[PDB]
Design a protein around this ligand. Structure first.
Ligand SMILES: [Mg+2]
Ligand SMILES: [Mg+2]
Ligand SMILES: [Mg+2]
Ligand SMILES: [Mg+2]
Ligand SMILES: [Mg+2]
Ligand SMILES: [Mg+2]
Ligand SMILES: [Mg+2]
Ligand SMILES: [Mg+2]
Ligand SMILES: [Mg+2]
Ligand SMILES: [Mg+2]
Ligand SMILES: [Mg+2]
Ligand SMILES: [Mg+2]
Ligand SMILES: [Mg+2]
Ligand SMILES: [Mg+2]
Ligand SMILES: [Mg+2]
Ligand SMILES: [Mg+2]
Ligand SMILES: [Mg+2]
Ligand SMILES: [Mg+2]
Ligand SMILES: [Mg+2]
Ligand SMILES: [Mg+2]
Ligand SMILES: [Mg+2]
Ligand SMILES: [Mg+2]
Ligand SMILES: [Mg+2]
Ligand SMILES: [Mg+2]
Ligand SMILES: [Mg+2]
Ligand SMILES: [Mg+2]
Ligand SMILES: [Mg+2]
Ligand SMILES: [Mg+2]
Ligand SMILES: [Mg+2]
Ligand SMILES: [Mg+2]
Ligand SMILES: [Mg+2]
Ligand SMILES: [Mg+2]
Ligand SMILES: [Mg+2]
Ligand SMILES: [Mg+2]
Ligand SMILES: [Mg+2]
Ligand SMILES: [Mg+2]
Ligand SMILES: [Mg+2]
Ligand SMILES: [Mg+2]
Ligand SMILES: [Mg+2]
Ligand SMILES: [Mg+2]
Ligand SMILES: [Mg+2]
Ligand SMILES: [Mg+2]
Ligand SMILES: [Mg+2]
Ligand SMILES: [Mg+2]
Ligand SMILES: [Mg+2]
Ligand SMILES: [Mg+2]
Ligand SMILES: [Mg+2]
Ligand SMILES: [Mg+2]
Ligand SMILES: [Mg+2]
Ligand SMILES: [Mg+2]
Ligand SMILES: [Mg+2]
Ligand SMILES: [Mg+2]
Ligand SMILES: [Mg+2]
Ligand SMILES: [Mg+2]
Ligand SMILES: [Mg+2]
Ligand SMILES: [Mg+2]
Ligand SMILES: [Mg+2]
Ligand SMILES: [Mg+2]
Ligand SMILES: [Mg+2]
Ligand SMILES: [Mg+2]
Ligand SMILES: [Mg+2]
Ligand SMILES: [Mg+2]
Ligand SMILES: [Mg+2]
Ligand SMILES: [Mg+2]
Ligand SMILES: [Mg+2]
Ligand SMILES: [Mg+2]
Ligand SMILES: [Mg+2]
Ligand SMILES: [Mg+2]
Ligand SMILES: [Mg+2]
Ligand SMILES: [Mg+2]
Ligand SMILES: [Mg+2]
Ligand SMILES: [Mg+2]
Ligand SMILES: [Mg+2]
Ligand SMILES: [Mg+2]
Ligand SMILES: [Mg+2]
Ligand SMILES: [Zn+2]
Lengths: 96, 62, 71, 48
RNA sequence: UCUGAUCGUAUUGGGCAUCUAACCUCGAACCCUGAAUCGGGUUUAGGGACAGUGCCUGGCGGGUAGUUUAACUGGGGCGGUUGCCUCCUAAAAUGUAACGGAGGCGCCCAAAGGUUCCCUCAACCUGGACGGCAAUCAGGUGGCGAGUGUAAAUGCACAAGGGAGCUUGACUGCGAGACUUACAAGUCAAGCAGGGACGAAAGUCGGGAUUAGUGAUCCGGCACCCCCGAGUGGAAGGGGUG
RNA sequence: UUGCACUACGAGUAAAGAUGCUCGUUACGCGCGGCAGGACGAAAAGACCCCGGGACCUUCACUACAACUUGGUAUUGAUGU
RNA sequence: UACUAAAAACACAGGUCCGUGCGAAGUCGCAAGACGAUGUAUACGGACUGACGCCUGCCCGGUGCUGGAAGGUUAAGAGG
RNA sequence: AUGCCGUGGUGUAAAGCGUGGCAGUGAGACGGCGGGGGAUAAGCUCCGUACGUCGAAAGGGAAACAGCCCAGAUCGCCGGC
RNA sequence: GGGAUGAGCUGUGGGUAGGGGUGAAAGGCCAAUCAAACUCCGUGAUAGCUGGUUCUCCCCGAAAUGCAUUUAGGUGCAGC
RNA sequence: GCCGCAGCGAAAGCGAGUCUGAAUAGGGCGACCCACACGCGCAUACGCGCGUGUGAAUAGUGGCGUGUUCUGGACCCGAA
């Protein structure tokens, strides 16, 4: 920068730290589930992977965005509260 | 040869969910006795990078 | 000799008849060269901001030049 | 002559405020009533 | 019996003395050796647990090595200056150079802060022991010519000047919207909530009439929160707030 | 040595000292022997001055190192006080 | 000072000081080894002065060198 | 007096604003007007000026004459003002 | 022009090697180059500096200012 | 394996939200469409969320050209 203290040196470091053991989930929304499975029925992680809504060899978490009308007994890890409520309202089951 | 990123730039900048680059503000590490709480509240938090420095910051981060 | 201080960019910022938003600075000054009127605060360093949206109005209040906001 | 002093809540001992004083003018410990965010109200504060 | 003074078996190190056997001798003699002032071996004469050397450690060290030794500038050197605040230059918005013309700052105040209430100064005139040009007193005249913690400028007599009572807002969590600005910084801010001060209430209060009294990032220290915790539980270490 | 060439002078003007521009004046073409006023003549990317780089030298500049030197410990044992 | 400087510069005989007791001090070398010297303080090395004559004054505060160890400060080790 | 801010009309194609790609420039000069430094000298030096030209602008005028006056070269013509 | 029996001149053979030698001392000499020789290699060293960078036409068209700077003949951002 | 497929937070974590905060306060970051109709409350109208269309339009990724850039001698030439 010509000799004055550069932008990347006059500014402070971003605070905090990074978690070495953080667990990451591949997420999917109930709206997506409803769009992919209009007929309902039991739905699993491998079915999600096959339909291409989620990555393979990854933990799957279901989120509660969108609307759901089909009755689906989905199985995943670590559901969200809203997604669980929507599943049980539509009449399916949300099991880990 | 793979391109290398700048270490200090990566420690001082980060991107948001839509692609903006944000930073923290200076003058907030020590000598805080004489600074009013209004000044410290203004200095608190994160802010977006100026449109004049965005090009150089992007080049540093990439 | 040779020393100096920075120019402070003082003076009127919004003129008579201008439409302003709430909180807009109108006059930067040392002391009360102008005096706050209706819908106009002062500020810790005589800054004469606008407390409401409206139009600027300069006037006289028995000796004091005043700046006021009309809604 | 005018050092930087810290005031701690007399109840929870939390250090909440830092300021200055004249050591010769007030050779003893400053006492003030300040709002303590931890205690949730105003408490007496003393120099540390 | 903190037992100072102290005795006997243990134990130990520090001095001193002696010894010889480690080690040392470019003292001597003999052999390898036929030709050897090398070397080695044997014996002897001395020194001797020292010296020398390895590792650790303090000192000294231009003997050697690598380097540094700012800028501005009516050429360079000499001298002076480098950041912040105020005025003029500056041409009636803002901004504007010079080694242009003048000054200040690197603080101070626990009240010189907040709030409630009250008051008006300097100067001049007249009279009055010390007291006089000028001390305190009384009566007139006096609208700002005093005063403002501190430079100057802009303000303040409606007082921001002077006096008294109570107090700690010299708060916490925020902050719409603006000034200024290459960036980094800097500046103002109504209003909301908590918990308070003063005030009968309306209200005012996030230091000081305003603008100087200050130093980015990195790296560390401290208090608090209990966020991560390298098999697990802790801990070390890190993290956030101040 | 050499950008050219059918390369005058005066007073001007111009990157302020003009063969080459202006206005004048003078001069037939070409050689030979001489002089050295100019061609900011030739030779040397100025040795003087400034900026940057280097090198070597100095020292109570900085940081190192060799050398010299201190103590501990090992080599390293015995007996008295 | 080969190739712009021959001198008042260097050397010198003489002088003083300092070191060296002997594979000395000093120097070359990591070391062995070597020179010093097949020498031994009337010798060897270093420094300054510079035939000869007359002389060489005062100052030990600074900095070096030499010597001393009462006190202060101070490393590793020991101790824990 | 000018200059500056806002606003309502009228006019004006190659104005303006945002966001990206690619730049160059950051030694300016002279002239007019207002100033500082200097001796109110300098072809001197430092500022201002929705001032000009040169830079990067040819052509005509000023004898010649970057920066002064007139005027901005798409090309051709032995036309005119 | 100086020395020309001497600290003389000279032939042959040999020795000292680069932070080293050698020097009656000039930073002198060490193969016509010495305030650190020469050769090859690191190596296509580095140079904010100087020079150079090759065919065409069409449209548009600057700057020499601000802030910062171990900065002033460089560069970063702004301006155009 | 990489990129896209959800973000926020220092992180534990939560998730169309999330962080700060006592706050269901305000803010930061992130998602969320309307040129419209119909039923619902709505207003004179304009829309405000929902069910569909009047069909309201997103989107990334891999290869190949070009400009600029990074690490390489890096446009070419040149020291002491
Ligand atoms: Mg901190
Ligand atoms: Mg604070
Ligand atoms: Mg000023
Ligand atoms: Mg203030
Ligand atoms: Mg007091
Ligand atoms: Mg020993
Ligand atoms: Mg040394
Ligand atoms: Mg040296
Ligand atoms: Mg080097
Ligand atoms: Mg200089
Ligand atoms: Mg000078
Ligand atoms: Mg002015
Ligand atoms: Mg002005
Ligand atoms: Mg001063
Ligand atoms: Mg006050
Ligand atoms: Mg009070
Ligand atoms: Mg007062
Ligand atoms: Mg304070
Ligand atoms: Mg805000
Ligand atoms: Mg309250
Ligand atoms: Mg307020
Ligand atoms: Mg003040
Ligand atoms: Mg650093
Ligand atoms: Mg563990
Ligand atoms: Mg810890
Ligand atoms: Mg000349
Ligand atoms: Mg002439
Ligand atoms: Mg002439
Ligand atoms: Mg002529
Ligand atoms: Mg001609
Ligand atoms: Mg001739
Ligand atoms: Mg001639
Ligand atoms: Mg010449
Ligand atoms: Mg020179
Ligand atoms: Mg030893
Ligand atoms: Mg010679
Ligand atoms: Mg000669
Ligand atoms: Mg001679
Ligand atoms: Mg000589
Ligand atoms: Mg010896
Ligand atoms: Mg002697
Ligand atoms: Mg001597
Ligand atoms: Mg002599
Ligand atoms: Mg002698
Ligand atoms: Mg002495
Ligand atoms: Mg002495
Ligand atoms: Mg003495
Ligand atoms: Mg001594
Ligand atoms: Mg003006
Ligand atoms: Mg652009
Ligand atoms: Mg420059
Ligand atoms: Mg310039
Ligand atoms: Mg003028
Ligand atoms: Mg002038
Ligand atoms: Mg000039
Ligand atoms: Mg001009
Ligand atoms: Mg040019
Ligand atoms: Mg022309
Ligand atoms: Mg033009
Ligand atoms: Mg012309
Ligand atoms: Mg005509
Ligand atoms: Mg003779
Ligand atoms: Mg003779
Ligand atoms: Mg030979
Ligand atoms: Mg060499
Ligand atoms: Mg010399
Ligand atoms: Mg030679
Ligand atoms: Mg060298
Ligand atoms: Mg290399
Ligand atoms: Mg054009
Ligand atoms: Mg610097
Ligand atoms: Mg994240
Ligand atoms: Mg906080
Ligand atoms: Mg929110
Ligand atoms: Mg595609
Ligand atoms: Zn407390």
């Amino acid at each position: 920068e010509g000799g004055q203290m550069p932008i990347h040196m006059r500014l402070p470091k971003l605070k905090g730290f990074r978690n070495r053991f953080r667990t990451e989930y591949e997420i999917v929304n109930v709206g997506d589930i409803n769009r992919l499975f209009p007929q309902g029925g039991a739905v699993g992680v491998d079915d999600l992977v096959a339909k291409g809504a989620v990555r393979k060899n990854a933990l799957v978490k279901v989120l509660g965005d969108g609307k759901l009308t089909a009755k689906v007994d989905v199985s995943a890890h670590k559901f969200s509260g809203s997604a669980r409520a929507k599943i049980t309202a539509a009449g399916g089951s949300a099991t880990e | 040869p793979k391109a290398k990123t700048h270490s200090g730039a990566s420690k001082r900048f980060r991107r948001t969910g839509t692609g903006k680059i944000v930073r923290q503000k200076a003058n907030r590490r020590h000598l805080l006795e004489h600074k009013p709480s209004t000044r410290t509240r203004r200095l608190d938090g994160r802010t977006v990078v100026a449109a004049n420095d965005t090009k150089r910051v992007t080049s540093l981060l990439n | 000799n040779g020393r100096d201080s920075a120019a402070q960019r003082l003076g009127v910022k919004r003129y008579g008849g201008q439409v302003v938003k709430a909180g807009e600075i109108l006059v930067r000054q040392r002391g009360t060269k102008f005096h706050p009127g209706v819908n106009v605060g002062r500020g810790g360093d005589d800054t004469l901001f606008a407390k409401t949206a409206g139009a600027v109005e300069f006037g006289i209040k028995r000796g004091r030049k005043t700046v006021s906001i009309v809604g | 002559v005018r050092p930087k002093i810290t005031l701690a809540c007399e109840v929870c001992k939390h250090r909440n405020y830092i300021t200055k004083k004249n050591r010769r003018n007030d050779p003893d410990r400053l006492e003030l009533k300040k709002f303590c965010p931890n205690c949730g109200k105003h408490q007496a504060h003393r120099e540390t």
